[PDB]
A paper describes a structure:
RTX adhesins are long, multi-domain proteins present on the outer membrane of many Gram-negative bacteria. To expand the reach of the ligand-binding domains, RTX adhesins maintain a central extender region of multiple tandem repeats, which makes up most of the proteins’ large molecular weight. In this study, we analyzed extender regions from two additional RTX adhesins, including the long adhesion proteins from Marinobacter hydrocarbonoclasticus (MhLap) – an oil-eating marine bacterium – and Aeromonas hydrophila (AhLap) – an opportunistic pathogen of fish and mammals. However, all the tetra-tandemers have at least one calcium ion coordinated in the linker region between beta-sandwich domains whose role appears to be the rigidification of the extender region to help the adhesin extend its reach.
Calcium SAD phasing was used to solve the tetra-tandemer structures to 2.0 Å (MhLap) and 1.75 Å resolution (AhLap). The repeats are rotated relative to each other around the long central axis, producing a handedness to the tetra-tandemers reminiscent of helices. Both the MhLap and AhLap structures show right-handed rotations, with pitches of approximately i + 3 and i + 2, respectively. The 45 Å-long MhLap repeats are similar yet simpler, keeping the two antiparallel beta sheets but lacking the ancillary structural elements present in MpIBP (i.e. the short sheet, and the helices). Regarding Ca2+ coordination, the MhLap tetra-tandemer is once again the simplest of the three. While the MpIBP tetra-tandemer was found to have many Ca2+ coordinated throughout its structure, MhLap consigns its calcium ions to the linker regions, with only one ion per domain interface. Each calcium in the MhLap tetra-tandemer structure is bound in a similar manner, forming an octahedral coordination sphere comprised of five protein contacts and one water molecule. The protein contacts are made by the sidechains of one asparagine and three aspartate residues, as well as a single backbone carbonyl. Taken together, these spectra demonstrate that the MhLap tetra-tandemer develops into a beta-strand-dominated structure upon Ca2+ addition, although some structure is present in the absence of calcium. To analyze the potential rigidifying properties of these interstitial calcium ions, molecular dynamics simulations on a di-tandemer of the MhLap were undertaken with and without the Ca2+ present. The di-tandemer maintained a rod-like structure, with the Bend angle between the two domains never deviating over 30° relative to the start frame; the two domains saw slightly more twisting over the simulation, maintaining a ~ 60° wedge.
Numbering used by the authors: 27 to 414
Write the structure that this text describes.
Amino acid sequence: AGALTVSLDTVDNTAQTANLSGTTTDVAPNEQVAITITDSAGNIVNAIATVGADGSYSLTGVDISSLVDGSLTVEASAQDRNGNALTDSANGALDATAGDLTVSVGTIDNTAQTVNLSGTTTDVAPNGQVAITMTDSAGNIVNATATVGADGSYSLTGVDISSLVDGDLTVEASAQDRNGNAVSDSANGTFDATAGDLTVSVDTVDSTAQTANLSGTTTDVALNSQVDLTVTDSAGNVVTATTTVGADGSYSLTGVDISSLVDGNLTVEATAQDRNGNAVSDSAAGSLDATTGALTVSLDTVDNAAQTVDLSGTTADVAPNSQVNVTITDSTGNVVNAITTVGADGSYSLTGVDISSLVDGDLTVEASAQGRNGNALTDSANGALDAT
Ligand SMILES: O=C(O)CN(CCN(CC(=O)O)CC(=O)O)CC(=O)O
Ligand SMILES: [Ca+2]
Ligand SMILES: [Ca+2]
Ligand SMILES: [Ca+2]
Ligand SMILES: [Ca+2]
Ligand SMILES: [Cl-]
Ligand SMILES: [Cl-]
Ligand code: NA
């Protein structure tokens, strides 16, 4: 019975050659064995060997540089002496080329929110797929796919990354080489499609509780980012507050303690950091009136012999070292004007004020000072001059 065997004895990955041998039964010496070596892409090497006196055959250094990596199938064929078709096959693996992949960002288009990518491969089959991942600073992901060309290159144009947020973008690309090995590369770049912004507003100043409610909005500020706030009063005193941004970019803080601040204008400033590392800020005006302005005046003494008066008074919500303006008007409209200073405790006095220019009869004392909320705070007192 006619028989043929073939074996693939060696594949030399460096020389890109193979050594084959086989045996025959009932094949005439000097007949030929036809050989094909087929690769993973269907490329064929054709070879021929002669059957020896002992029925054996071999080929050494067969050129397989035309073949691609992956499985090799060897097919041998011959005819026995009576013409019967004989066949056998053998198998091996070729790994003459190291698998590799590169990926590179051509552009991140901040205006269109798109990315152009390109890359190269080695030992990845044309029409192979490259799995592409783009990951943002928040862990959002865009998936994409590209087809490997004849030269092993791949590219994508205008991939939509409008679903990603600003900051570092990581691009990962992966494929499989013809020996079944994962090949991968990554690249990185900056995404800055959204202008960072922050607003702040004074919702309420509760002058009874001496608290403030503050809120605002942000653009391009990451979830849980810290907002630092300052509240500044009319004397330069500062209260600090802090809160965090929500998913919609809003922030709120209720019951901020401003008992340490004095009455008058407030300035609130808020600052956060956007996704591209910029400080974004806003300021807003408020008003504090925890203490009702007041002024009293008293005519303490009229010295009719020296023609003088002693005056005193009290204030509430008048900054110490403010001026108090005092007028003393007599019964015919003559006026004495004086000025003194509000003390640490809000009190003021004038002693030995000369009223020798006034005439006998009624005296009216008027005192005025500016409170911290900008009011003219006044009081009067009445007495008499009897110098003649
Ligand atoms: O209120 C806003 O929307 C933003 N701010 C501008 C924010 N400023 C703050 C500052 O410089 O003090 C610019 C910035 O945040 O750097 C006012 C405006 O431009 O309408
Ligand atoms: Ca290979
Ligand atoms: Ca940005
Ligand atoms: Ca006040
Ligand atoms: Ca008199
Ligand atoms: Cl031969
Ligand atoms: Cl006032
Ligand atoms: Na008078």
